[PDB]
């Protein structure tokens, strides 16, 4: 099954780090954005 | 690359590894515990 390019990324070297924040984490932080746009605007970002 | 998460030496002498990518039921697999030394077996596998 092994033969395309991104096994060859683990052949030789190349490692890929995962993030500190995976994508579901970006989706709790960009919901809380998103709410923060709907129904506190743009007052968010200031403090609470 | 196996990431190891160090504290400062002049206070502490333990230490956690993080397999990069590698499920808890893999670690044996992902990194060779048959062969190793008994100080690698305990921050290799546990309950922690």
């Given at each position: ?29 960009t919901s809380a954005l998103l709410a923060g746009t709907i129904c506190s605007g743009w007052?968010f970002?200031?403090?609470? | ?48």
């Open positions: 099954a092994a033969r395309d390019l991104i096994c060859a990324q683990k052949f030789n070297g190349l490692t890929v780090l995962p993030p500190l924040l995976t994508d579901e984490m970006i989706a709790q932080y007052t970002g200031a403090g609470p | 690359g196996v990431s190891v998460i160090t504290p400062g030496t002049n206070t502490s002498n333990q230490v956690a590894v993080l397999y990069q990518g590698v499920n808890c039921t893999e670690v044996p697999v992902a990194i060779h515990a048959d062969q190793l030394t008994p100080t690698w077996r305990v921050y290799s596998t546990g309950s922690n």
